[PDB]
Design a protein around this ligand. Structure first.
Ligand SMILES: Nc1nc2c(ncn2[C@@H]2O[C@H](COP(=O)(O)OP(=O)(O)OP(=O)(O)O)[C@@H](O)[C@H]2O)c(=O)[nH]1
Ligand SMILES: Nc1nc2c(ncn2[C@@H]2O[C@H](COP(=O)(O)OP(=O)(O)O)[C@@H](O)[C@H]2O)c(=O)[nH]1
Ligand SMILES: CN[C@H]1CCc2cc(OC)c(OC)c(OC)c2-c2ccc(OC)c(=O)cc21
Ligand SMILES: [Ca+2]
Ligand SMILES: [Mg+2]
Ligand SMILES: [Mg+2]
Lengths: 54, 334, 437, 428
């Protein structure tokens, strides 16, 4: 009902129409969890090569 | 071969619907959590409407309308009638009702109560039935629930012989296309103990409920008067028919209520479709005026009428969407 | 003027990137070689388009885009395609072995070996920027690269560019469109890890786009090209305000302000009208009223859900073509009386309208017909949580039996991350329900 | 993620293996000499997956031919497409394995394994990006069974991150060479459970039954059985060999087909079933292919899918057809048989389409099923095993090679474990 903040130009126009009023981890912390996953992979591969050696 | 799932086994109506579908030999029942169904006979609470209509190669249908609880909860119904311009606000067929919260519109409830005090007349209300406001305004805090104070119908229609009170239950089916089908057979849930207006404290004559009063079976089987017998009574005792004096108002109330919520609940352009069976509860006064009391989302049918209604639900709500390899309903045209 | 960098991760992000940058070039009048004849300031400028394009001495207009995939074959089609000259070879980064539909493989295993290289090529574009405002990130929820590598990148971009805004264009998985079976897992894991790093995310359900292509474009089996050309139209509508003169959504910060009052609930629903087949012989051109009314039909949304059973927090209308404020306000007034539009008590019931007079540009020989007027509505409704509920249920079914989990654990990921991701999603679903009812 | 190294071990492995290279060389337009003579560019676009490009221009199969006996490989070399294979890739002993797993795995085969692995390394180094290995072999004999599994173990040591893929032919009393086949098979299954990502269970019983009941051949030879194997092998490798809608590799297949690491034994299927030489006149409609490929009569593993539940399903349609009709029919099978597909893996059936049809058919369908019904195959082998083992019968052939009774007990236990593991997901 109320048309506010009307702004016009050559390209177009913009406005607001109101009907009713109202009633991060560190660089080291990232590299730590990535290397913790790399070591878990390396342990699983070591357990595999141990099994294959047996 | 169409497929269905059952997710409410406490449902008397849809237990009969399920077995009727299986007996055709063209429907197969799946386990609760199987997503690959055509039809869902769903649960009463927390129904997962967000999971429907996302199975490719399956037309999916549910026996509940999402948002229909807004008509089916006592607190919600009052808010709907008061706010919606279709029904607002001095509604001729709905008793004066006020939403009451325990720790709200109870400051404006007292203003109309004082009009009933200054103008010396009847001032009886229902919640259990109260005599005065302050005597049961702490009763909502006693139970700790959000309940409605509604105007009590002091002068109701009385059946003879017996001097009795009654409510009418009508069963209404809204299909996927939003056709409003009223089932031709209704039931009068009758009181057996004669109505007393001098003191309102006894349970038998005042409360109209089937489960509470179980006097029982004196005038008819299980306090249940059917439509042919009640029409016959009106012809003899009042020189009028059921369709003229009562049923036209019933048809008006049903259609007015469901046309109001149509934009909010309709599944016309949706990826899944809905039907629903409703239970409309009516009250008739001395001047033959029909009043709405309650709308039921999950209604239970009368014992005599199960076979016919459940076949009717299969006929026009299920078989219309999923066709197989006179009508018992009155279509309410809008 | 403030520049914007677009990041395209995995197959979905790359091919959608192709579709968008093709469309931008047609819109701004930039040729396949990168020449823009309408541009008069040779080799530089601070115009509205310069937000997305930079300039070289030879008058070449190059996208502020980085393409990243863990496998060569898709970006190799960008390297040899019709827009090969448009991009710098350093902008197009490819690995050797893909993430095999595995989040953990994309995030942890192959993620680690490429993350530092990608951030260097991002820094090389950021050093060309006089005033960086942030990033527009394109990916799938479903793929291993799209889920895994994106969430790692989004973590690192928060570290290196803390003052900068990050927007997502995310492809939500659909069984209809070539879906891997473990895609619910990948979707949940990437949503959890990205949720605090993303300012505003636009979800695009492949199911919705597939059906719009069937229903409105008359294509019986839509290909990726069919889907992406439609997606790029929606993306173009959303980004137009950054690329053109205007006063609504002029920077990435304004997307947060106008659309996201609650930081976690940062998934606006997009609805687009009209989608008209180019093969359609006789078409009655639709009015302002008709296209705005079509913004409230579920069949037009980017995600299939029911806004009537939910609450709005914000609503933007973005028009392209022959549209004037008078017609918009008349349309809104008619729609408000007939449709179920409920806002939250702590928000004004209202619409922020932006009009661009240039009608939407369609790719020559495409599937979309030329229209006189078009609209994209962006509304932050709680109804979109339906998509989370659908996805969480699928996650729950598989995880209860620990199905496929071993593939993730075998890449170094602990099992506890699955349940940590699911708890966050259970919290997110509860946030939506608090606001919504 | 392009190159696959192919290995064929023993009599059965080399006979089915030669037929595989015969069929896919015809599909890729490569003559018996090695030169390309086709009409489409689609035949050459992903030819590097199975072939090495030698300057000529000629195409040499990335295939290694292994046996402890020189017999079969001389028949392969003098066979139809025999002169296409790199002569250095022919690695053979002289003594044979005498249908003895122990000879293949521990004694005779151990002597020859290193020479094979040198040829494998020579092929692996030429690969721009090696995705994995595929083995063709029987489980019933000595070389393919014993040495084949020894090879798998040693390849996994040198290439622990690569995908191991097998086409493993299962023994049957119906098509039986020796009584010791259940011993050799049980020992081999133990190894396959541990050391492979994907195993195509090709039951000889099922191949016989198809040849007898459906193909109407009174006395089928191994050649009739091998026609069905190569046609299935062509079908399962279609997405690796041709450019299509999807970038498809062996790892992505493994991730999506195998929900639990041990349960990676697949039922292969083919539609329509054809006898060799006999021309297919009537074209099948899309509903007919879909009905036939899911039919138990078309399965290459003699298990009834109705006795189990499908964990995952892969389907490959070949030929010029409506992809909408394919999508509709595939959804129709699932929605009308939904109990037979596990509800706890959503959308577990995936479908691909390739435009190029196989030789002599206008449209075909290849089925890959990870069903819990495969336990029937393993139970059968276990029953035959226990019948002999309870009396320690024929065991001296193995104990004479160094083996102890304990290793037989351990193999019996591991296979009975796999059976009960399949049963775990058939009910719950
Ligand atoms: N709309 C659209 N969706 C796509 C496109 N490509 C893939 N998808 C979807 O994205 C999901 C798979 O993710 P991809 O992006 O293919 O995987 P990826 O990011 O390359 O990761 P990898 O697993 O390493 O291949 C599926 O749900 C597909 O339907 C595309 O071009 N357009
Ligand atoms: N399908 C098929 N099975 C075979 C073939 N040759 C042998 N077999 C089966 O393989 C088993 C014997 O293995 P074989 O490969 O001859 O022994 P190896 O040479 O020591 O590996 C028996 O179970 C036979 O039924 C063949 O050409 N095709
Ligand atoms: C559409 N996504 C595919 C990727 C993996 C895949 C590879 C493949 O070639 C080796 C193949 O043909 C045998 C496939 O089957 C069509 C798949 C495929 C595999 C199975 C699926 O599990 C049900 C899946 O989710 C994804 C696909
Ligand atoms: Ca300029
Ligand atoms: Mg990829
Ligand atoms: Mg032999």
């Amino acid at each position: 009902m109320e048309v506010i903040e009307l702004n016009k130009c050559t390209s177009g126009q913009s406005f607001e129409v109101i009907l009713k009023p109202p009633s991060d981890p560190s660089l080291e912390e990232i590299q730590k969890k990535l290397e913790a996953a790399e070591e878990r992979r390396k342990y699983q591969e070591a357990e595999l090569l141990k099994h294959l050696a047996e | 071969m169409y497929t269905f799932v059952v997710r409410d086994e406490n449902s008397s109506v849809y237990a009969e619907v399920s077995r009727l579908l299986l007996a055709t030999g063209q429907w197969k029942r799946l386990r609760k959590d199987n997503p690959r169904f055509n039809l869902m006979l769903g649960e009463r609470n927390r129904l997962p409407f967000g999971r429907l209509g996302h199975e490719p190669g399956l037309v999916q249908l549910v026996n509940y309308y999402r948002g229909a609880d807004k008509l089916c909860r006592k607190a919600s119904l009052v808010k709907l009638i008061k706010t919606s311009p279709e029904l607002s606000e001095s509604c001729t067929w709905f008793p004066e009702s006020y939403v009451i919260y325990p720790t709200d519109e109870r400051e404006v409830f007292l203003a109309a109560y004082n009009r009933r005090r200054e103008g010396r007349e009847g001032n009886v209300w229902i919640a259990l039935i109260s005599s005065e406001a302050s005597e049961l305004l702490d009763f909502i805090d006693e139970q700790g629930q959000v309940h409605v104070i509604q105007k009590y119908l002091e002068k109701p229609l009385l059946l003879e012989p017996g001097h009795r009170k009654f409510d009418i239950r009508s069963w209404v089916l809204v299909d996927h296309l939003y056709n409003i089908y009223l089932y031709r057979e209704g039931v009068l849930r009758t009181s057996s103990e004669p109505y007393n207006s001098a003191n309102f404290q006894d349970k038998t004559c005042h409360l109209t409920n089937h489960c509470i009063q179980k006097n029982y079976g004196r005038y008819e089987e299980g306090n249940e008067m059917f439509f042919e017998e009640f029409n016959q009574y009106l012809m003899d005792a009042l020189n009028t028919t059921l369709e003229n004096s009562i049923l036209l108002q019933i048809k008006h109330i049903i259609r007015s209520c469901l046309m109001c919520i149509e934009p909010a609940i309709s599944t016309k352009h949706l990826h899944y479709q809905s039907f629903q069976l409703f239970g409309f509860d009516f009250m008739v006064d001395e001047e033959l005026k029909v009043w709405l009391i309650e709308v039921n989302g999950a209604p239970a049918c009368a014992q005599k009428l199960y076979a016919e209604l459940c076949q009717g639900i299969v006929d026009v709500a299920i078989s219309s969407v999923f066709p197989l390899a006179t009508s018992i309903f009155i279509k309410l045209h809008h | 003027m403030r520049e914007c960098i677009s990041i395209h991760v995995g197959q979905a992000g790359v091919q959608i990137g192709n579709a968008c940058w093709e469309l931008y070039c047609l819109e701004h009048g930039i040729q396949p070689d990168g020449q823009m004849p309408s541009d008069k300031t040779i080799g530089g400028g601070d115009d509205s388009f310069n937000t997305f394009f930079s300039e070289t001495g030879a008058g070449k207009h190059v996208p502020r885009a980085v393409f990243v995939d863990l496998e060569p074959t898709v970006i190799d089609e960008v390297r040899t395609g019709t827009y090969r000259q448009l991009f710098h070879p350093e902008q197009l980064i490819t690995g050797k072995e893909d993430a095999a539909n595995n989040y953990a493989r994309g995030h942890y295993t192959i993620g680690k070996e490429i993350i530092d290289l990608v951030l260097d090529r991002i820094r090389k574009l950021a050093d060309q920027c006089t005033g960086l405002q942030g990033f527009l990130v394109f990916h799938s929820f479903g793929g291993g690269t799209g889920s895994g590598f994106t969430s790692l990148l989004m973590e690192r971009l928060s570290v290196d560019y803390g003052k900068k805004s990050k927007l997502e264009f995310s492809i939500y998985p659909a069984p209809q469109v070539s879906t891997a079976v473990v895609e619910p897992y990948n979707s949940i894991l990437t949503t959890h890890t990205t949720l605090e790093h993303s300012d505003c995310a636009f979800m695009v359900d492949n199911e919705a786009i597939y059906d719009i292509c069937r229903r409105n474009l008359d294509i019986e089996r839509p290909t990726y090209t069919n889907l992406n050309r439609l997606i790029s139209q929606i993306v173009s509508s959303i980004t137009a305000s950054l690329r053109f003169d205007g006063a609504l959504n002029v920077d990435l910060t304004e997307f947060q302000t106008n659309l996201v009052p609650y930081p976690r609930i940062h998934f606006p629903l997009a609805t687009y009208a009209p989608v008209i087949s180019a093969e359609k012989a006789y078409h009655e051109q639709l009015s302002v009223a008709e296209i705005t009314n079509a913004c409230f039909e579920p069949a037009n949304q980017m995600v299939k859900c029911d806004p009537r059973h939910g609450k709005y927090m914000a609503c933007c209308l973005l028009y392209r073509g022959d549209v004037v404020p008078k017609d918009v306000n008349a349309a809104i007034a008619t729609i408000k009386t007939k449709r179920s539009i409920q806002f939250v008590d702590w928000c004004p019931t209202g619409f922020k309208v932006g009009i661009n007079y240039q009608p939407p540009t369609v790719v020559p020989g495409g599937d979309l017909a030329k229209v006189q007027r078009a609209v994209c509505m962006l509304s932050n409704t709680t109804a979109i949580a339906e998509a989370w509920a659908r996805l969480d249920h699928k996650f729950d079914l598989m995880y209860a039996k620990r199905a496929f989990v071993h593939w993730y654990v075998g890449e170094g990921m602990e099992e506890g991350e699955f349940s940590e991701a699911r708890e966050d999603m259970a919290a997110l679903e509860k946030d939506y329900e608090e606001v919504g009812v | 993620m392009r190159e696959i190294v192919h290995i064929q071990a023993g009599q059965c492995g080399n006979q089915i293996g030669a037929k595989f290279w015969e069929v896919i060389s015809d599909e890729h337009g490569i003559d018996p000499t090695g030169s390309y003579h086709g009409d489409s560019d689609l035949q050459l676009e992903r030819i590097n997956v199975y072939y090495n490009e030698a300057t000529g221009n000629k195409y040499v199969p990335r295939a290694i031919l292994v046996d402890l006996e020189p017999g079969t490989m001389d028949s392969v070399r003098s066979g139809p497409f025999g002169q296409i294979f790199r002569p250095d890739n022919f690695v053979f002993g002289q003594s044979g394995a005498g249908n003895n797993w122990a000879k293949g795995h521990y004694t005779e085969g151990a002597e020859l394994v290193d020479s094979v692995l040198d040829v494998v390394r020579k092929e692996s180094e030429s690969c721009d990006c090696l995705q994995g290995f595929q083995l063709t072999h029987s489980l019933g004999g000595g070389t393919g069974s014993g040495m084949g599994t020894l090879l798998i173990s040693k390849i996994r040591e040198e290439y622990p991150d690569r995908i191991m893929n097998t086409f493993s032919v299962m023994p049957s009393p119906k098509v039986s060479d020796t009584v010791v086949e259940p011993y050799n098979a049980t020992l081999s299954v133990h190894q396959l459970v541990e050391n492979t990502d994907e195993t195509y269970c090709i039951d000889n019983e099922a191949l016989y039954d198809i040849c007898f009941r459906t193909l109407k051949l009174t006395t089928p030879t191994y050649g009739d059985l091998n026609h069905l194997v190569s046609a299935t092998m062509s079908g399962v490798t279609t997405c690796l060999r041709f450019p299509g809608q999807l970038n498809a590799d062996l790892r992505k297949l493994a991730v999506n087909m195998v929900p639990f690491p041990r349960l990676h034994f697949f039922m292969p299927g083919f539609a329509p079933l054809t006898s060799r030489g006999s021309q297919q006149y009537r074209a099948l409609t899309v509903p007919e292919l879909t009905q036939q490929m899911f039919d138990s009569k078309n399965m290459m593993a003699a298990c009834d899918p109705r006795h189990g539940r499908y964990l995952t399903v892969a389907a490959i349609f070949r030929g010029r057809m409506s992809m909408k009709e394919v999508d509709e029919q595939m959804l129709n099978v699932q929605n009308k048989n939904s109990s037979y597909f596990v509800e706890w893996i959503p959308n577990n059936v995936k479908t691909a389409v390739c435009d190029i049809p196989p030789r002599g058919l206008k449209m075909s369908a290849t089925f890959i099923g990870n069903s819990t019904a495969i336990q029937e195959l393993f139970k059968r082998i276990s029953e035959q095993f226990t019948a002999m083992f309870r009396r320690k019968a024929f065991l001296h052939w193995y104990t004479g090679e160094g083996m102890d009774e304990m290793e037989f007990t351990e193999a019996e236990s591991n296979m009975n474990d796999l059976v009960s593991e399949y049963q775990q997901y058939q009910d719950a």
